Design a protein around this ligand. Structure first.
Ligand SMILES: O=P(O)(O)c1ccccc1
Ligand SMILES: O=P(O)(O)c1ccccc1
Ligand SMILES: O=P(O)(O)c1ccccc1
Ligand SMILES: [Mn+2]
Ligand SMILES: [Mn+2]
Ligand SMILES: [Mn+2]
Ligand code: NA
Ligand code: NA
Ligand code: NA
Ligand code: NA
Ligand code: NA
Ligand code: NA
Ligand code: NA
Ligand code: NA
Ligand code: NA
Lengths: 513, 513, 513
């Protein structure tokens, strides 16, 4: 009768680092996530889920509004989110739920709503208006660092230097050494302690909780013993072209990122380019990444154990997802940028209340992060806002993929200049011409740029997106077809704020179909 | 060069429980507050400071907007605060400061800004829009209780029963026994730990912090050994009429509260009326109240010690105040209600940065809680909003009371029906007729009711407000004079949102004088 | 079954220039208004009606919001009206009526809603947001002058020179000559033609129409033959002190206006002070004023005739009123300023649909211009907005004055500096200290200034307000009593926007009593 929602949002966790799917495909599950595996056994694992944009700001705007980037317009980190969009926090209040949130949303405020001197305009983003923060990372991670200091741990003068490899002789970069922060004071421990505090405060009352984890976001360094938990040789090999120049030749945007991404954005204090990492260094980076993932899973076990002991597990809808993926060396790239699958494909696992009709199933239907907000509101008995682009995933938990479900995946990326990454001059583009959209299915992937060449991949023969076919005249009809599907997608998703209203002889009315 | 502001807001702490003033008047300082005494030695103590309204919701609306109740209209607990009023949190963002807040504001949201199903409409109030919460009590004190539970302390099924006197044989009410919560898990310890966490996270960067404490708000029970720290016989005697009926005869509103106030609103689980407490029980209640005060002072010492060790004390403006006072048995009343001095008189101590020109001085100028927000913004170099009713107190820290400073104190009280206290039927009044305002100086006090008889007191001969003179024809000219001052006060404080703007032949302009 | 509302708002028309009341008191009705007399015979004439403030901007804000100046804050001409106040136009849309308006409202826009370069900030005011204009005077009377020019009449280079007395030898000032504009092109003819156009466009459909007339607002010059219609010797004598200095001695605000008012504000092109007009000139001015009044009445006859011929008269609520009064030489003043009765007392005549239960009655109950908006909305079946200060007058049309009706009249005046009248330096006052309020009944009148001496008049012995008694110690109790009534009035009318809402255990609720 009581209904809780636990929305777990990790950061930078790839869809192909989900053991349940690896085992289903007969692959070696090279990492351990027993608590995520529990959700998979009890619920539905969605194997074709994408975030509709990257990096964190855009991806979290889509997750928390149910809108594509084409509508929310929070197109990059540092770009404001218009206050007109209804977010999940405000919608939760509409159904009587407190929108409690741990972690962060990386939201720049609307300048029309606050002073231009607002300190929230000094950072990548701050908490989205409408949520109730009960465990904030805070900008500059001040919430975490203050908790570390209050726990009695002496921090270095530059606090992110806790993420340098242990030892004054250590070389910054991919490392086999632990970080300089003990496990009991890690950021994953922090968010977990906030979750337990909040759940204990609720004392059995119905809850919504957005439980955000920073890891496995970089720096790719882990508290002991997670730094040594996986052997580099057991990791999947990175997938990349023969050298960075051949890789970059595919497209100007690929060249910009191959040339510009720096190791220091991924390892604390590191020097050099991301593209020059060798296979051994990429394998070590992947092993450390897996260590950070297992630490999150260990922490989730503590949260799940509290739900078990208080008898709330079977009353709670649990949704596990990530904001976006990570290239992890694929295509000579680090991070979440561009158009490749690994930046956008993300885990999604949903466990309904009670015994799940499809417990253990793996769903191939094409799902998008914009679907999560409608799913939560549907489940709590609210109406889905008219403006949302996504649709509720609840049918997948009972009977399966609806007959009229989408037949392609869609995502977008905007690469206009921000303070730390400025491709416009290299690309020769103005700020409103720096975007792309992607449409794909089981067979083909089409990447359309507003003002650069398009790309087209045959995923059966070229699953790793190495061979652009868009300019091959033998593919003209196929490229036409996918450009046409994407164009229809644009038309179908124009803003829906008031378009159901009608004047007329009987006064104001609303159309429902 | 760096400037910090620490605004300490305690709850329910009377102005006559401030040792520095007691000693200056040659009275016994019957309670210990060495850390407040430090602020008094280093700064200016304002001995005639009032909150402009009670209880917490109205008083905090005035404190955090600089507006009288006549303008903010958050007239009682449970009544919404209109979003149009500029609050201190939003004003702080206007000067580049993060408006960090610990404690609570007891603010009901504006219904035009949120769903009517919003859970914030189930409680007395929630956090005021525009602040950055870093240590929230939360509604139902969930933040505190979750922190207690996470600290490993087993709570009773009804969590406020931690405030029953220790021992299953204990009788609820005024008590010589400790509460059932250890000192290390008290609510004052909680807010202090949040303050230290926040200050350690700041790591020397400029800060604003609203450090709110719940104590000495009831229940009047204290963790050991604060419950035994003061002897009842050493406490000041309550000041009240010969019996509750003679007290109630003064005015219908006095009768309503004398008849209706229940001991259970002041001692956990207690039965009976507040007015029937005997002198010994009132003395014990006062001794417990002093214990709660000293616990807060002990906690402030920990905050001050961190500022001392980090070298920030001399960079920080420290303002110590209370939201409102407490009758503490005076006039047979418990709580913060009506029109008597003890409900509205509150401490105010201000320590400027560096060596204070008036260190140790006690100021008799008439100050009001609406002055605190203008003071903070003036000190940080911002403009004081046009709409504020209060004025900056900074002149008092250097040269003294301005020549044109106010010559009377003013406050208001609205007693329209709320869910837990409904005087309208007894008084025979409609909801918009249930208010009073008060004006007073060193000699006379005038209490004007919208729709009940007025009251007038000669404070030299009748300092404790026992003898109404308003209906004595020999006082007609004096009562006229004070009604006239109060009427002028109303006219001078009509809303100022746009009244400085002018159209005219040169276009839109603003008048400054 | 169909219901229409015709709200006729003239400008600057005194309550003692209403023939129906003059005849009832056995006085000579020295002016002719047969069409107003028809309304009086068929409806209720309110003989104690006041505008709650002057001049046009403030008075029309009160009329069109139902709010006292203390709440609407449009305190003078040129001062913005806050958009938060619900006006009659928007309320009419709430009941399905088009808020058609002819004339003007003299409303300065809220600067938060429009560019500071908006041309509406160059003028005294423009149309209030929310009305549907169907016959606007326009700023600078451009709508009227364009209609004159399109009618083929050649205008002078400075268009207001149509109001110079006829003849190049004419001396500007009070005159026995006609204006230089024919009757068929007068401003009263213009507004009437707009009214007939609008009513003919409606073609029998239900209507609301605000029919505004500029006259008898100055310049006090009339089209032929209205300039010669009344003999100066038949006019009521102006009521004033022995000389302007003795008049001015009563109060600093009286001195400011006696000294500063110029004849050119009342007669086109005239030179000299208003206070030095002799009795003959004041008599001629009064005769011209009566001529302008009869012209309006003639025009109303044309509107009434259209309602008669289309069978709509008995379906229409007709309300006749003025924005404010006019000193007309009383107390050496011209215009609508200060505190005297003639500036604030105004006509009010209401004819219900069908046969009126109180046809011909004269009502002595104290009514205020804030009552008109609630009356209209009540009559159309809408709810009266919570925020309104006024109350519906409908009970007066059936059974009579409610038992709990107000027992005093109230009005306000704010005299802070505007571009054409700047008393602050002479008075020594700041901008927020330049107001007064007035309370009066059949016996006594009390004028309270925010920051200047008060005034008190015994209206039985001193009906024309010549003898201030406020400083007479024998009146201390009476002055006390009236200051107390006014103070209660302030408390009872604090803003009511959200004060009926309540949070509580059952969620958001509203109190109705
Ligand atoms: O966009 P990101 O995932 O790098 C991010 C940004 C700010 C805080 C946390 C994560
Ligand atoms: O008005 P109060 O001081 O009793 C109050 C209300 C809610 C929370 C804290 C204090
Ligand atoms: O205030 P007023 O009645 O002189 C006025 C102002 C502008 C247009 C019409 C009337
Ligand atoms: Mn991210
Ligand atoms: Mn309080
Ligand atoms: Mn006017
Ligand atoms: Na960055
Ligand atoms: Na190619
Ligand atoms: Na096609
Ligand atoms: Na309560
Ligand atoms: Na008495
Ligand atoms: Na006086
Ligand atoms: Na003018
Ligand atoms: Na006199
Ligand atoms: Na009285």
């Amino acid at each position: 009768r009581k209904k809780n929602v636990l929305l777990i949002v990790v950061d930078q966790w790839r869809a192909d680092f989900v053991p349940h799917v690896l085992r289903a495909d007969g692959k070696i599950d090279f990492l351990k996530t027993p608590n995520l595996d529990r959700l998979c056994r009890e619920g539905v694992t969605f194997r074709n889920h994408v975030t509709t944009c990257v990096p964190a700001g855009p991806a979290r705007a889509s997750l928390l509004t149910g809108l594509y980037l084409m509508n929310h317009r929070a197109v990059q980190n540092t770009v404001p989110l218009d206050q007109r969009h209804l977010n999940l926090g405000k919608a939760l209040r509409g159904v009587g739920y407190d929108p409690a949130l741990i972690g962060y949303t990386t939201t720049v405020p609307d300048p029309r709503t606050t002073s231009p001197n607002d300190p929230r305009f000094r950072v990548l983003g701050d908490l989205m208006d409408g949520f109730h923060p009960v465990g904030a990372f805070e900008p500059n991670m001040e919430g975490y660092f203050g908790w570390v200091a209050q726990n009695g741990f002496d921090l270095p003068e530059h606090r992110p230097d806790i993420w340098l490899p242990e030892g004054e002789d250590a070389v910054a970069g991919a490392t086999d050494r632990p970080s300089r922060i003990p496990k009991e004071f890690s950021d994953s421990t922090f968010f977990t302690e906030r979750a337990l505090t909040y759940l204990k405060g609720r004392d059995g009352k119905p809850f919504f909780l957005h439980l955000g984890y920073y890891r496995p976001h970089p720096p790719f360094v882990a508290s002991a013993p997670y730094h040594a938990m996986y052997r580099p040789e057991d990791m999947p090999a990175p997938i990349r072209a023969a050298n960075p120049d051949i890789e970059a030749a595919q497209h100007p945007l690929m060249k910009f990122y191959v040339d510009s991404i720096r190791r220091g954005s991924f390892f604390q204090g590191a020097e050099g380019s991301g593209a020059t990492l060798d296979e051994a260094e990429l394998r070590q980076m992947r092993a450390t990444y897996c260590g950070l993932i297992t630490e999150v899973d260990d922490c989730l076990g503590r949260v799940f154990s509290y739900l078990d002991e208080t008898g709330q597990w079977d009353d709670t809808l649990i949704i596990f997802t990530s904001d976006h993926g990570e290239q992890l060396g694929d295509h000579h790239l680090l991070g979440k940028i561009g158009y490749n699958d690994p930046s956008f494909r993300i885990p999604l696992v949903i466990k309904d209340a009670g015994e799940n009709a499809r417990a253990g199933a793996i769903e191939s239907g094409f799902t998008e992060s914009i679907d999560v907000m409608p799913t939560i509101l549907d489940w709590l008995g609210g109406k889905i806002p008219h403006a949302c682009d996504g649709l509720s995933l609840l049918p997948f938990l009972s009977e399966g993929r609806p007959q009229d479900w989408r037949t392609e995946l869609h995502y977008e990326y905007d690469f206009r200049d921000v303070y730390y990454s400025e491709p416009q001059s290299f690309l020769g583009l103005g700020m409103n011409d720096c975007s792309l959209c992607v449409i794909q299915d089981e067979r083909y992937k089409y990447v359309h740029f507003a003002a650069l060449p398009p790309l087209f991949f045959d995923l059966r023969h070229d699953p790793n997106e190495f061979t652009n076919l868009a300019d091959d005249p033998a593919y003209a009809a196929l490229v036409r077809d996918y450009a046409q599907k994407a164009l229809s997608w644009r038309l179908k998703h124009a803003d829906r704020t008031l378009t159901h209203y009608r004047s007329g002889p009987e006064g104001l009315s609303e159309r429902s179909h």
